[PDB]
């Protein structure tokens, strides 16, 4: 009745596939595995989808035993917060392009939420558009199917035969070789038996910004750099809201050169200094450079594909990186490497980082984080762990001399010392370093405070405060790092949009990042799912929408 049933047989197949020298040997072994599993007396039948769950990218609900007979089916147990699930989506996209509904394959996303916020249908509907998921989707918010199957990992794939008989499970990310081997040979087998039908299954506004991930402010000239993630472009905008430069879009890409030529792929982090913007070009797995004087884009880090390198050390364009989410200047570029749960550095000029030797110009490496997904604090940077670090902010002045890290999957904020690299707790989470489920919405001191998937931090040098974009609680919070006291600055915690209002009566919706102005009078917020930049006046305590024209 559970995925336990496949484990002795499928691991016996996987042991043979490692001694298999030819692609034909591997194909015949998988075919022999399916002869065995198909000819079992008692199928490991999938539970039916619970009735009255909400479905996306379909006309009506889908049921395994009325609508998916005669089909190979890939269930994707996933949640949109998890970077491991995000990394899998390109592999499912490539599978759907290879094998249509007509060819006998359907993929179903069984959205099984980690966080409370992701249970809300409209927040899944946004995520579907953000990540461009064009296959059927079910909001299994209580995670009934997950708990019945004893799924234990985000993501889990479960491949079904034509009568809902479970054939394979693939746990986690980057099993593209096996996903293709298993589904291709599953189709081949059941087509040779004449059990795969060729029937169809039914599947299904120009604003100026579209899901803006991040924003930053030039200290000298008070211009905004907005990552307009959904339009796959960067905007340079004056303080009054007039657009100076639009760079990229409307389509994805990796193209360098002039600004009509240039293209990005869901950019998040942006930083600026001396007319040079660095972009964390997240789904390209690249750092890009925009030169505003020369009016040219170039690539400074990443090879263009998802790294699994946890150590690094190569020069820029020969160093694989994994889903860079935020960037800030330090002379160095600090990088929140969400994909490998680490803080990285690109050395813009040749220099030396805390607890390492001199490194040459262009060297791209890990600074902090083991690479394990953990809420682990440590005096030694390598032995500490992060959990999808998505925000940075530099406080270089004394007595801080630290990098503030929004650590999203842990629901904490972290300091990393710029003297000795010590990664220390600030607010949120629990003491247990393997506990990634210590989330909530509580104002308090240290571990007593609770956050929910925070994506942005910005440091106020004037007031000695940190503003946290506490994204899934739909709230800007304020942390005093001396006392470690964390409290709500603005946001009711609902998502019903409001243009002009006070801080306590204003609203946000999954704010992806934020940044303070030079003067310390304005706090700009990338209010992602409202498709808007929110300007918070810290003097009048009024929120306004930045007009863009």
Numbering used by the authors: 9 to 212, 219 to 344, 354 to 572
Give sentences from the paper.
NHLRC2 (NHL repeat containing protein 2) is an essential cytosolic protein of unknown function, mutation of which was recently identified in association with FINCA (fibrosis, neurodegeneration, cerebral angiomatosis) disease, a multi-organ condition which is fatal in early childhood. NHLRC2 contains three domains; an N-terminal thioredoxin-like (Trx-like) domain, followed by a six-bladed NHL repeat containing β-propeller domain and then a C-terminal β-stranded domain. The six-bladed β-propeller domain comprises six NHL repeats, a structural motif originally identified in genes NCL-1, HT2A and LIN-41 and shown to often function as a protein-protein interaction module.
Crystals of the longer NHLRC2 fragment (aa 1–572) diffracted to 2.7 Å and also belong to space group P21 but contain four protein molecules in the asymmetric unit. However, in each molecule the electron density for first 9 amino acid residues, the loop connecting the Trx-like domain and β-propeller domain (212–219) and the fragment between residues 345 and 354 were either missing or of insufficient quality to allow the chain tracing, suggesting flexibility of these regions. Consistent with this the Trx-like domain of NHLRC2 displays the common features of a thioredoxin fold, containing a central mixed β-sheet surrounded by three α-helices, along with a Trx8 family specific 26 amino acid insertion comprising an extra β-strand and 2 short α-helices inserted after the second β-strand of the thioredoxin-fold. There are also two additional N-terminal α-helices which fold over the Trx-like domain of NHLRC2 in the crystal structure, forming an N-terminal protrusion. The CXXC motif or CCINC in NHLRC2 (residues 89–93) is located at the N-terminus of α1 of the thioredoxin-fold, with Cys-89 and Cys-90 protruding from the protein surface.
